[PDB]
Structure formats: C-alpha cells, structure tokens
Request: fold
Amino acid sequence: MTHIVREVDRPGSKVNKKEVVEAVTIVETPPMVVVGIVGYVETPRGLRTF
Amino acid sequence: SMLRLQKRLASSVLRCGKKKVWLDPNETNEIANANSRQQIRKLIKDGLIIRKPVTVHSRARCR
Amino acid sequence: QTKRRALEKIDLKFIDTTSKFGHGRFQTMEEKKAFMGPLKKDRIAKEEGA
Amino acid sequence: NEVVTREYTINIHKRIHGVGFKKRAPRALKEIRKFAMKEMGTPDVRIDTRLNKAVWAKGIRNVPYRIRVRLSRKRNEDEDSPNKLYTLVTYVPVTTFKNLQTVNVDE
Amino acid sequence: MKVELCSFSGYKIYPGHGRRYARTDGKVFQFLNAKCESAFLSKRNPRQINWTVLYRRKH
Amino acid sequence: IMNQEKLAKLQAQVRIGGKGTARRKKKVVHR
RNA sequence: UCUGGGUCGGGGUUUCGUACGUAGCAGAGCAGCUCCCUCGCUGCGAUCUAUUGAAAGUCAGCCCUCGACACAAGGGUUUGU
RNA sequence: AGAUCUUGGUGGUAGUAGCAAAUAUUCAAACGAGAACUUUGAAGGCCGAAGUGGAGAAGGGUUCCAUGUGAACAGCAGUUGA
Ligand SMILES: [Mg+2]
Ligand SMILES: [Mg+2]
Ligand SMILES: [Mg+2]
Ligand SMILES: [Mg+2]
Ligand SMILES: [Mg+2]
Ligand SMILES: [Mg+2]
Ligand SMILES: [Mg+2]
Ligand SMILES: [Mg+2]
Ligand SMILES: [Mg+2]
Ligand SMILES: [Mg+2]
Reply:
C-alpha cells in the first residue's frame, strides 16, 4: 500500500477542486498466459464441463 | 568415579568450604583412591588438591 | 456503474514513495543524497576511488 | 576431503530472535550445534568450553549478536562408534565482524 | 504536490505525513513524526539536538 | 630444564581456569 | 537448467542520536615549579568542541546481491483399471 | 438382581486430568550396558549474615559413617539416595 494526492471533481462537495490524500493498494500483474480452453453446456442440473 | 567424600575431607583438612576445594579433573583415579585424611594431606602436598583463592570483592570503588 | 462515484475521471498529482520500512521521509535516492550531502562512507569510498 | 577445518561467523542475533530471556544462551548453544551439524554433516558435534564461556560471557539473556567460530572435522577413529567423524567447534576471538568471509584454514 | 511544510527539525513534510498542532495563542506547528513532536512538546531546543537542521546550520 | 616443546605444553597445565583465576603451582607424583 | 537454495559478507532502507581513542590557548576552578618563565609551564577537573548525521542494530516474517564458502540427482513408506 | 446391602475383584472414564508457588541453567570429561538429573572441572546465576550459612532444645531413633546392590521405593530418570 501507499497513498496519493489528487484533485477531486465532485461538484457540490466540500472537496470540490480540492486536494485529497487517498490510500491506494499496488497489485502487481504480470501478463497472463493462455494455455487452454474449456466449454460449458447448460443442463437442467446446472453448468457442466463439456 | 564419585568424589563426594574426597571433597568433604579436603574441605575439612584445608579448613575452607567446599567452594574453595579444587580436585584435579585429570587425576580423578588418584584422588578416588584417597579414603583417609592422611591421604588427603598427601594429595594436598603433592598438588592434586588446591584451595582456590577467595573471590575478589574490591573496596577501591568504595574508597 | 452509473453513480457519480463511479465513471469519475482520476488524475493523480503525486504518488508517495517514502520508505515504508519505518518513518520514511525522502521520496527518492537522489533527493536523500542531495539533502544529506556526502557521508563518511561516501568519503571512505571516494578516497579508495582516487 | 574429510579432515577439513573452516572458520565461520554465526549470526547469533538472527537465530535467537524472539526467544525468552532465560532461554537465550541455551538456545544459542543449541543453534551453534545445529549450525555445525548442517555445515559439516556430522551429528557428533563437540563444543569447546572456551566457546561456551564466550557465549555465556554476558549472562543468560544478553548473548553476543555475532561470533566467529572454527569448525574442525576430525577423525573419530578411536573406538567402535556409530559415527566415524565429529566436529569440534572452537572459539575465534575477533575485534570486528566487518568484511569477514568464510575462509578455509590450513592445519 | 501540495504546499510543502517544514517541521521542528526543518525537514520537508510530504502530504499525508506527520501531524499538525494548533496552540491556544494562535500559532500552528507541524511535525514530521512523533519524535519531533515529543521533542517540541518537552520544550527541547532544536539548536541542541544534533540531527536537526537548525543545529547543523548553527555548527 | 626447559625447551620449546616443554614450555608450550607447560602453559596448558598451569592454567586451570579462565582469566582471573589463580595459576596451578605444582603437580608432583611421589610413591 | 540458460543450475538451485542456503550461510556469511556487501549495498539499500530504517531506528537511535554523535562511539572508543586522540587533540584542543574550550572549561567553574584548584594543587605544584620559578636559572626556568616576564606571563609562563605541569597535574586534577564535571562538561564542551573537532575527528563524527558518528558509533551500534537492522529479518529472525525488510529490499537487492552475484563477492566468498560449502552443499545439493539423496533417504524412507506405499499406490493398478 | 436389587436393600445409597457386606467383603473381594474388574471396567469405561483414560494413556485422560494432571507431574506450572519461591528468576537458571550451559559446556567438556570420567565411571558406566545405559547420563537432562551421579561425580570432577569451567562458566552463568541464586540464598545475601532477620541466609537456602554455622550450631543447639523438644521430637525422631540409627536416619550418622564406609562399602556393596540396582528387585521394590524416591509420583520422569538415576551410575544417586534419609
Ligand atoms: Mg511501515
Ligand atoms: Mg545485511
Ligand atoms: Mg449378587
Ligand atoms: Mg496431559
Ligand atoms: Mg503441567
Ligand atoms: Mg550474582
Ligand atoms: Mg543476590
Ligand atoms: Mg540456621
Ligand atoms: Mg548418609
Ligand atoms: Mg520414579
């Protein structure tokens, strides 16, 4: 986690065009690699793997 | 092997407590043969039993 | 997402990068060096570096 | 070979962290023995009395943070024993622990 | 990115860091951390604390 | 008399403790 | 494996706050020496100053190493339409 | 078959509750089949003279001392022991 500073664009608010400090969470996301495909079929018992 | 009697007799002969009695850890067999106060005296003479010096309690700080 | 909380444009002005391993007080290495100047270990490395 | 002797430095502070006051020096001895077993692969580890005196030098709870020891692997070919090798860990007094690598030492 | 403030130690206080102290007499002080705040509250002089900016520029 | 081999091992037997303890005076065998 | 993970070491971060020693015509003063000095020298003395944001710790559940060292294709018990 | 029956034996509970008042142990060696607990040495501590020290009265009665044993006992162990 860390925190940022940004200007708010919320009309009618007390923080309108005002700076705020907001806590943010950093989530590292290296690209996903696609290795398969699953198909599902709708059954009267639910979805089942086809 | 077990030298409780030797420590007690050495304390009695040396006129000190069992704290100050030092038995030679290498001559355990020779000391174990000592069963009488004459033999304790002989061991003290021969250097196998030593009265350890009094723990230092200085008064230089007090002075 | 139709509320004004959502679909609101976000424009950051500052991201805090102070050290989180304590009470960090310098954003970058260079800012810390420019504030604190040379140190003893810098001097002993620089004497060896001629 | 197998009669090698080496000089290590052990982060006692790293291995004792979190241990209660009345347990820090006995756990220091246990971690020293475990370190010797791991480094030399010998379950039979003998610790010099000078090393024990150095670990216990500052009492039971203020154990030194670092210590320089010497692990010597020696031939236990003295009697019929399950282990034919053993490690004698001796104490190496040093002034500073900066830039001390693990170095092989000759006989 | 906002107005940069200075502490009891003279260090820059970035947004979202430290505290701000407003006295009854009308003076507003800002501190970088609780160490500087406790030093200020105990009326310690920054010109005698070795790591403060004021001591550095005094010596 | 004392030579280098005798001296280097003599240092061991006279020390019966760490720093601050009295030195061993003698170890004499007599039958 | 285009090796790996450890253990030290290093660097980064951070915590505290300026280490031992040395030097000082710094220091409340005090005690001796006067061919000496013409205002000096020799000790004691909390504290101060410089060396010195120094010293010390920092993963054990902090970050990065490619420096050093040794170690890692090994052990056991089972499982079949 | 009963009498919260008498005496004796045995279960479940159950390898469970529990073996937590008074700071603390560690290293090496010896004996030994066998050592966390015995002994020696080294270290770290404690009682701190209104003591966990040194001696008595009452009470105990051989617990004193040495040697030997490792059946039982010392609610773990023991090469030790009242
Ligand atoms: Mg943090
Ligand atoms: Mg490091
Ligand atoms: Mg019946
Ligand atoms: Mg239980
Ligand atoms: Mg219990
Ligand atoms: Mg004490
Ligand atoms: Mg005491
Ligand atoms: Mg009494
Ligand atoms: Mg008896
Ligand atoms: Mg029992």
Remarks:
- Chain E has two helices and four strands.
- Strands of chain E lie at 5-6, 12-13, 19-22, 28-31.
- The two ends of chain E are 32 Å apart (CA to CA).
- The longest helix of chain E spans residues 34-41.
